[PDB]
């Protein structure tokens, strides 16, 4: 009987591939060939943040574009001032091997987690003035890979259990469970409207999820290896994913297929982080070669290189306003570029 | 803007306090030596953790040896896909790899060998030393002395293998037990020497689940690793 299900799945996949091919009347590169190239932008480190002990693994810019949160595996979650480089808070983490961090839009709460399988919440604006654990989300059965705040009460978290979950910070329970991924989820990305989120699960495929409906709305299979990074396009209609194959691929929720690929022969190392600028014309992706290459979202060319780090690049994020970009690396130093 | 300057001074004072706290944290950290404990599911690593300690995805085991803080971390309750989260332990002082030598037939010894090879070849682990604890030696002795579990049936190269000259057999141990032990050791020595060396070293130690000298062995391995890391300083 399993052969019938296998043949049915094969025919469904073939029909979906034929449909995607029929919708591919043209290619984004052939149409953008007329777009003016960005050329070259010599970005320099305007601010250097020091104080982290162990290798930094995660980072997330704040909506205010002033404060930033970075998580290191030394058991500390430091908040830095983008303009003055002054550390605002020094939150010691109960779990040393922290692998994710999230800064709430309002800045009243902060989340983080890792191998402990617990996404602890921290309140930065307590009446006492100190930062204390607000909620512990210990329902996951795997290491927390990435987390992003939907609001002051809702937060999406990725775990090594190959399933994402929507959490209610007030009650501390899984509001909705997202199943369907084959491998361990690595990164998360919230749409501008906070209604959809995508993620890779070490299966060379990205899935579109609905926060309210709680189902895999769409699925992409453009990559060829494990996906470690994902970020939505500023418009919310497309997203780019970073994989160990050393290639970045742009996917559109409406096209349901890969639009273009960003890669180079000399670039053979894996990808760790990917992010878009305010306009989305620049695709800043971190690579394991100790430098971050800026790829033109339209021309598929390297518009710049950020070789200021001495160790592997782990996280990368651009401010909502797009003023400056900070690149995290295992060297325990955060460099802000502009 | 006098208020702006006052807020800047307050933030500078807070940053100085946080810098003092981070200096204290670094003094406490560099004095601490983190260790990763890994091994097959059928290995006796649980007994080792129990002896050393006498829901969460990771357990912390804190033990002191000669006034030296050691933080052994168990990564139990985690899926067997280790290719991703194993990278987080690149900076650990050593990776305590516990393998059951008597677990050879499926053939769990082959799986342990492949896991050790992958750990030794992992790019992000080429600078991390692995402490190979060949656990469950009494079971291997009982199986090879009075038993029909011929190693040549699952390791044809064993038929031509012979005890090396540097072998230090235990007083009273049967020659066959020592031969099997040293063959299983060379099985990992080949992988650890032909795949690369210089950046990290393997410390094979014949131990048992109830052996209390595992703590002293880990202490000596950490001493050797820190000495070999300090030796790198003297290279301009």
């Amino acid at each position, epitope marked *: 009987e399993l052969d019938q299900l*296998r043949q049915e799945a094969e025919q469904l*996949k073939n029909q979906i591939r034929d449909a995607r091919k029929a919708c591919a009347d043209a290619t984004l590169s052939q149409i953008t060939n007329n777009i003016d190239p960005v050329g070259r932008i010599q970005m320099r480190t305007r601010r250097t943040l020091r104080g982290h002990l162990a290798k930094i693994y995660a980072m997330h810019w704040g909506t205010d574009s002033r404060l930033l949160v970075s998580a290191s595996q030394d058991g500390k979650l430091i908040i830095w001032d983008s303009y003055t480089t002054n550390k605002v808070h020094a939150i010691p983490l109960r779990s040393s091997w922290v692998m994710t961090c999230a800064y709430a839009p309002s800045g009243n709460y902060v989340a983080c987690g890792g191998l402990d399988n617990i996404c602890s919440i921290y309140n930065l604006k307590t009446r006492e003035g100190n930062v204390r654990v607000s909620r512990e989300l210990a329902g996951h059965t795997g290491y927390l890979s990435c987390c992003r705040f939907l609001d002051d009460n809702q937060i999406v978290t990725s775990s090594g259990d190959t399933t994402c979950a929507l959490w209610d910070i007030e009650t501390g329970q899984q509001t909705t469970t997202f199943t369907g991924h*084959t*491998g361990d989820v690595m990164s998360l990305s919230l749409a501008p409207d906070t209604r959809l989120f995508v993620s890779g*699960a*070490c*299966d*060379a*495929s990205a899935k579109l999820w609905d926060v309210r409906e709680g189902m895999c709305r769409q699925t992409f*299979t453009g990559h*060829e*290896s*494990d996906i470690n990074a994902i970020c939505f396009f500023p418009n919310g209609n497309a997203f780019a994913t970073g994989s*160990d*194959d*050393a290639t970045c691929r742009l996917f559109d929720l409406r096209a349901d297929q890969e639009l273009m690929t960003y890669s180079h022969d000399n670039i*053979i*190392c*894996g990808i760790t982080s990917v992010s878009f600028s305010k306009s989305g014309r620049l695709l800043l992706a971190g690579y394991d070669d100790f430098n971050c290459n800026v790829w033109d979202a339209l021309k598929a060319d390297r518009a710049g290189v950020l070789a200021g780090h001495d160790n592997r690049v782990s996280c990368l994020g651009v401010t909502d306003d797009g003023m400056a970009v900070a690149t995290g690396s295992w060297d325990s130093f955060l460099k802000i570029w502009n | 803007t006098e208020d702006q300057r006052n807020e800047e001074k307050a933030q500078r004072e807070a940053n100085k306090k946080i810098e003092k706290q981070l200096q204290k944290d670094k003094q406490v950290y560099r004095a601490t030596h983190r260790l990763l404990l890994l091994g097959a599911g059928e290995s006796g690593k649980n007994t080792i953790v129990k002896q050393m300690r006498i829901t969460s995805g990771i357990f912390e085991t804190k033990f002191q040896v000669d006034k030296v803080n050691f933080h052994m971390f168990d990564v139990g309750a985690q*899926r*067997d*896909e*280790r*290719r991703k989260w194993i990278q987080c332990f690149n900076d650990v002082t050593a990776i305590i790899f516990v393998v059951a030598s008597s677990s050879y*037939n*499926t*053939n769990r010894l*082959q*799986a342990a060998l*492949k*896991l050790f*090879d*992958s*750990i030794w*070849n*992992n*790019k992000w682990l080429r600078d991390t030393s692995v402490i190979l604890f060949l656990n469950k030696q009494d079971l291997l002795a009982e199986k090879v002395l009075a038993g029909k579990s011929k190693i040549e*049936d*699952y*390791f*044809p*190269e064993f038929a031509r293998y012979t005890t090396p000259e540097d072998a230090t057999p235990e007083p009273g141990e049967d020659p066959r037990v020592t031969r099997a032990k040293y063959f299983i050791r060379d099985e990992f020595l080949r992988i650890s020497t032909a*795949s690369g060396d210089g950046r990290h070293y393997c410390y094979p130690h014949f131990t048992c689940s109830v052996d209390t000298e595992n703590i002293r062995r880990v202490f000596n391995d950490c001493r050797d690793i820190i000495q070999r890391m300090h030796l790198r300083q003297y290279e301009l």
Partner: nanobody
Amino acid sequence: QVQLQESGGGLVQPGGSLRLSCAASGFTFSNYKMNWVRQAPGKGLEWVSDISQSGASISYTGSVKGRFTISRDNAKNTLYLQMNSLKPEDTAVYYCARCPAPFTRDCFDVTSTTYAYRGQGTQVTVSS
């Protein structure tokens, strides 16, 4: 999408010979290491053999050395495993496992849980 289609398996008597074939697709067959794994009836996954990218380094398990021959041809993205002499205990579903990442030699495809880069496997049985 990564796709692996194993073939060439079937029934055989003790001492026969089979030649399994796996059709690779959806990736650069030459940039990834190929590994053969089997799951005996009522047992877990067992590593059989592997072949490097260029095909120079080859290794087999002790119960397979000098009995099976692995081979690959990147010119068509296909893997092979020549079985010279089988035995009853060889009955198992042979799955084709690919390296997790390219340009690497550290494999973690022996995972018991569902591996995202393995084929459906081919059923091979030996009986007198």
